[PDB]
Structure formats: structure tokens, C-alpha cells
Amino acid sequence: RGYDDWRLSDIPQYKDGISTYEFVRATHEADYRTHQAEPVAGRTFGFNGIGRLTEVALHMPTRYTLHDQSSQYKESPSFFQGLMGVPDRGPVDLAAFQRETEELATAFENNGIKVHWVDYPEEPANPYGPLMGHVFLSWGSIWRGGSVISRFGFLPGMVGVSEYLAKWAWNTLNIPPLVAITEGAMEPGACNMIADEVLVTCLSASYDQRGTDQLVAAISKTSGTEEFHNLQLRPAVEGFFNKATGACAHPDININAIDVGKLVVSPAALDWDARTWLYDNNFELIEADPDEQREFLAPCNVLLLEPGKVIAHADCHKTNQKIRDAGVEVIEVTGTEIRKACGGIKCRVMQINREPGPTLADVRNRVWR
Amino acid sequence: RGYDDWRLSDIPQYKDGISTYEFVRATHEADYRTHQAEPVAGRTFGFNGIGRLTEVALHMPTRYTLHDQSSQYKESPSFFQGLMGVPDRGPVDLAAFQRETEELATAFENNGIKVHWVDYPEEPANPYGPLMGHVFLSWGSIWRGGSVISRFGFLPGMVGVSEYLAKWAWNTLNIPPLVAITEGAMEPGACNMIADEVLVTCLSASYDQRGTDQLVAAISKTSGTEEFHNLQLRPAVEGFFNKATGACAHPDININAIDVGKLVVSPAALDWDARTWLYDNNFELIEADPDEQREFLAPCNVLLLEPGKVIAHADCHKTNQKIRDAGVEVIEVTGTEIRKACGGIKCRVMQINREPGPTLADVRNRVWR
Amino acid sequence: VAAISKTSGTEEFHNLQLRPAVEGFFNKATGACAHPDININAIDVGKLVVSPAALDWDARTWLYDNNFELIEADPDE
Ligand code: NA
Ligand code: NA
Ligand code: NA
């Protein structure tokens, strides 16, 4: 449209003969996401809900992506092993990491999902040392209404990274920021949603109440839903992972949706209140294999492409059979090298756009018991 | 510093033999602004308070900066005149606007203040028409903790602009976003502060309670102060300006600090509660000339360079003499063309960095009555 | 808690409430248990033996703030 062709009718609040007060009031009342964020961006965006995923980003590793190449790791491996708590499976192999990355990318293209590639500078560092954990682009996933700057609870090598990814989203995709988390801890990217307006968090190394409150209030306002629910798990875990039990600081290792009102869930995730809530809201639970969970094969770290279809680690054989048994298609993908750090396949995907999908009301109305 | 020279001692929460829990807890407790925002930015930033201003940005106008060149203005001038409500002083003269802009910039350099220049694309438009009001870079002023995306109450031509300026701040200065205002209305840039932790807002076309609450909560957390106070004026005005009284939707037309515990204030600004509060907190009031105020010469739209020194419109002779009488140096600067839109000199300056300055306790302890 | 509070003979009464992840009595995948006495006990003044599967973040914070020293039970046991 031409610069001199604009007219007052292009302003949605304008009406012929409207008063100043009524125009201003219509403006105060407009929805931020649909009046400002999306039009200005010139597109929709956000990973909220359990609808159809259409657009993601990955990072292809270099030597600088590997945690064991940091001089701070070299100085004390046991310090970082205490923070993450994941079983030692020996050093990361760069070439194999790159291959499993190509395979994941192929899986996306074979399922009609656009993949962007995020690079970091050579010798990437923040004010406190080499970047660490920066392969895990879910930490920069995009919410309805915009990007979020996280407060990392346990990993100093992620300081500056959620900024970097948000900046990248703005410069490359034109997607704006929504909020910076400025108190306590909140890593929203590692959360999952189990319905259009149901978020799962944890209270953990990665989340305190203040951080959670800040995040939930911001994403609530732009979620596009009348209601917003936060299920808050309470795992027993000091750092990121408890290799004695399989409990994890992050929701996305403990639980995810695999279909409408159907969840894959860890043995170590559900306290009584959480269990009661899932029960009252008609969610059907598929239990992850306990050994797969405890040995950190990340069987719950599946990525939902759409209700009834997930990407999962190819070697989570037992959990995957149970998912198939629940009527869900599983796309097996190699994810071995990625687990050598604190995460699996879902953890490493930055989700950019997911179309609106089924709601909590849909879950509740499902007849299955 | 070299990429392989980093050690655990470069992590401020690290201590030899610290437990995972204690390390995580120290991390949850760290201050966002001083641990993350500023280190990652690699500088300090924020205009908060009444301390020494060091860094700003201006926009040098082109024909596309002029409000009367918009096809939507051409279609109905009376519609835009109802929104702003400012006295008609005839069309803007581009050449004169450019000259008064050079003069303002010279004033900054003569006072040791760095000036950045913001350009817009040719034929700048948003989803709803030509940009309008985009010369007013105070709307993009930077807060301690980061940039803000505003919700404009009355001007649709500012949609997309606060995003643009925030994006510019991030790409050019490395300053991150703090929050997007997503409900009601809040134009934080047009507010002023009268002490290190005292903000003045209005309830007006430009601000509702929900928007105000959202903004104040975000900037509170990063203000670097134990307390945060919001004085909320209640002007009687439908749009932006009331040419019968001098009342204005924006704090920065109604009031500003000129020194520690000394304010220049409009006749039309102070309701009883506001007056009581200023009185109880030991603020000395200098009244702006009523005619200067009502005729929209913007005598309160002075910019505080530091306690005891302001930039003011050169033709606000009466108000300026009173400011000098109160012991404050006035740097007179031509601001005629700028007033042909909804604003004056302070309105057009994006404030990027102001050093910490006097506090509310300092105001209260001043012996003057 | 209200009943035993009134007769405890103490000015204050505190209830630490663990939140184990367990459906029935015992979770043989983790060691989590419905009963406190399988999850934790005192062994001395301000010293506790505690299961890996017992302490959620709030419980952990509370024990920390109140100066309790924790001895971890062997995970396999
Ligand atoms: Na719970
Ligand atoms: Na008031
Ligand atoms: Na507890």
C-alpha cells in the first residue's frame, strides 16, 4: 500500500464522528497481541498449547558448543557434574553430535516444519566465562505475545544466551520481546504445556515462586485464552537431575502431552496435589519406563508435533511402545550425544510457532475412563 | 580475556567447596540489573532519577516527520486536532524544525552530553498508516534494567515506534528490553522522576491503572532502590491537551524537577491529594506562568541535565525567570516548531543514561521552609 | 496438628510437610514413600538421615534456613 493512500478507515478504532474519549477508550481496550505485537511483527508466533507445530530453530554444534571444552569444566568437572547431576556417559563426540543434529533436522523437513539455524560467535563467552548449554534452544522458545529473557537458576554459561536468542528472533523474524524475568529463577523454555492454556512448571533449582509469578502473569495477558492454569510440580532434586530417582528440575524431563488429554509422565514427577489435579481434569497418564527415566534417556523429553504425533529418542524403546499403545505416532530420532549434557531432543529445539490447538475444555469433555 | 583463561573464580557465586544448593541459592538471589542486564550489555544505562544526564538520542526531521504530511491528517485535520488538543500555530516549517534541532544538539555537546541520531526509513508506516509523532524520542527513553514497549493511548502513528526504538537501543547500544506493556495504556517515556525513586504518572488518555501497575512493577524491580513511589496526577483533560486550562495527559507537560526537592509545576496539575503528598514530602513548588502553560509553550517541559541545571524553551520567559529565581541555571533553547505537535524539548529527547542522583530521603532532609 | 499442638508443652509448633511423588505407599522406581518415617528421621541434634527422594525445594530451603545438617541415605538401600 502507498504511503499517501492511507485513510482513517485503516485505523480499526476509528469510526466516522467518534469522540476523542470513545476513540481513546477503544484504543485502551484493544488486545496487545492482535492489535500491536503481531501486526507490527507482520506475522503470528508463539509455541503455546498442544496444536500443530510449524516452525523451529536448531543449533549445529561446533567444538565451542561442547561443555567439556570449557576451561571452567576442565578446572572442575565434578563441580559441573554436581550442578547437572546427569549420569556420566563419557565425553561428547562432535561428529556424532553433528550427525544426530542432521537427522533431527531431516525429521522436521519430512514433517513439514521449517527449520532455522542459530550460530554463535567463535570462542563464545559471557561476563562469567565460556558459554555453556547454549545448544539447548528451547530456553529461547517464543511465547504468544513475544520472547522472554530468562533468569537461569543453576547454569552461569546461559547468562546472556536467552538475550542473544531473543535479539536473534527480533532481528531475523521481527518477533518482539514480551518480558525479562528479573527475580528469583524461571527457565520458561524448559516448561511444557498440556492444553492450550495449561502450563506445567516446577518449583526447583530452575524456578522459584517469584520468578514463576512474574512469567505466568506476563504470558497470561497475551495467551489469547480466557483462562490460564499453572500446574506446579514439586520434584525432589537438588540440582538439575537426580540420578537415584529420575526426578528433574525441568518440567520437560518430567512430563509432556502426547495427545488431547493424554500425557507421558515420569514416576518421579507427580506429588499428590499434581496427581489430584490431573485426575480431576480428566488427563490420562502414560507412565514412562522407570529405568529409561532414571538412566537419563529422557523418555519424557518428546516433542509434540501435533496431537497424536511426537518426536522421541530412538533408544527409549519401552516408553515409545507405550506411546504407540496409547494411539500416538512416534518418530524415532537419535539423541545420544545431546544427553551428555543436561537435556534431550525437545530441550534443544527453539519452538517459534505453533498453531492454536485443543483446550482444557476439550480435555475435560474427552470420554475415555 | 582469553577463551581458555576463564576459571571458576570468575563466577561471582562460586566459592571453593560450595554445595549445589548454596550455589543455586546464591544465583537465585543475585540482582538482575547488576548481575545480568548491565554485564551482558557491557555498560550501565537508564534515565531514572534526578542525577547527571550523560547520554541521549535525537531525531533530525525529514518531511516524513511532519504530522501535517500524513494522508490521514490531510483527510481530517480536525480529528487529529481533537486528539491532541493543542493550539493551532499554523503548519510546521521543516527548515526551522531542523535548525532548532541543531541548536538543541549543540546545547547537549556544550554541556558534555553524548548525542545519538535516530533515523526512520523513508515513507515510514505501521500497520495503520504513516508514522506520526515519531520525533518524540522520550517515548523510547531507557529505564534502569532496560527498554520498554509502550501501549499508546491516543496516537495510532506511534504503534511500532517504541518497538523500533527499543530494537535500535539493543542493536546499537546493546541495551536489552525489560518489559512490554500489554494492557490498557502507559506511555512511560512521557513521565518524569522527581527523586531517585519517585515517579510521576497521570491517570489520563495516556495511562490507566492496569498499564501503570504493569510498568511500575517492572521498573521497581530493577530501579536499584529499596523503595519506589508513584505520584499519580489526575488532570482534567479528554485527549492530550486542554487549551482552556493547560492541563495535559502527560506528566512532562505538568511538572518536572529543577533541583533537589524543587519542582516546576503547572497550575492545572495538582489535585488535593497530589498537593498533600508533595507537601508532606518537603517538595518546594515553583509555579509555571499560567499563560505560558495554557498557550502550550511547554514551560514545564524542561529537561533536567543535573540538579540545578535545565534546558527550557527560550520563549518561556516568565517561567524561566522564576526558575532562575529559585537558584537554577536555565539553558534557553529554541523550541517553536516542535510545539506544533503534541510536545516540547524534553518530549523529543530519548534519555539513555543518567547517573544515580539525590533520593527522596535527601529531599525530605532539605531544610528550606 | 491442631490437637497435638495444644498439648505439646511447647510455645511453638512447626509442621514440615514433604511432598513425595508416589501413588500408594512406596515407589520402587525411586524410593519415595507416602510415610515420613521411610523418608527422613533425626539421628542427633540438628542432624538428619534423609532419602534422595524426600526433599522438594521448599522442604530443602526450610531445613537449610533452620540449620539442619543432612546425611544422605544410600540411594540403592
Ligand atoms: Na503439585
Ligand atoms: Na493525585
Ligand atoms: Na515441602
Numbering used by the authors:
A (entry chain A), B (entry chain A): 11 to 379
C (entry chain A): 226 to 302
Sentences from the paper on this structure:
Using this process, we identified a variant of NnhA containing three amino acid substitutions (T2I, G14D, and K73R) that exhibited a substantial increase in soluble protein production in E. coli compared to the WT when analyzed on an SDS-PAGE gel. We isolated and purified this variant protein (referred to as “soluble NnhA”) with a yield of 8 mg of protein per liter of E. coli culture and compared its catalytic activity with the WT protein. The purified protein for the soluble NnhA variant crystallized readily in conditions containing polymers, and data were collected using crystals grown in polyacrylic acid or PEG. A combination of single isomorphous replacement with anomalous scattering (SIRAS) using a single mercury derivative and multi-crystal averaging between data in the P1 and H32 space groups were used to solve the structure. With data close to 2 Å resolution (2.04 and 2.16 Å), the quality of the electron density maps was good and showed unambiguous density from residue R11 to R379 at the C-terminus. No additional electron density corresponding to metal ions or cofactors was seen, supporting the evidence by enzymatic studies that these are not required for activity. There is a single protomer in the H32 space group, but the same domain-swapped hexameric structure is formed when crystallographic symmetry is applied. While D262 exists in two rotomeric conformations in soluble NnhA, only one conformation with a slight displacement is seen in the structure of the C357A mutant of soluble NnhA. Hence, it is possible that D262 has mobility within the active site, which may play a role in the catalytic mechanism. The crystal structures from both space groups show that at least one protomer in every structure obtained in this study contained electron density for a water molecule within hydrogen bonding distance (2–3 Å) of H260, that would be also within 2–3 Å of C2 of the covalent intermediate.
Mycobacterium sp. JS330 produces 2-nitroimidazole nitrohydrolase (NnhA) that circumvents 2NI activation, conferring 2NI resistance by hydrolysing it to nitrite and imidazol-2-one (IM2O) instead. The initial characterization of NnhA indicated that, unlike most other known enzymes that degrade nitroaromatic compounds, NnhA is a hydrolase that functions without catalytic metal ions, molecular oxygen, or other cofactors. Despite low sequence similarity and limited occurrence in a few soil-dwelling mycobacteria and Actinomycetota, NnhA maintains the α/β propeller fold characteristic of GME superfamily enzymes and forms an unusual hexameric ring structure formed by a trimer of domain-swapped dimers. The residues in the active site of NnhA appear somewhat conserved in comparison to the ADI and DDAH, with the catalytic histidine, glutamic acid, and cysteine residues present in NnhA as H260, E197, and C357.
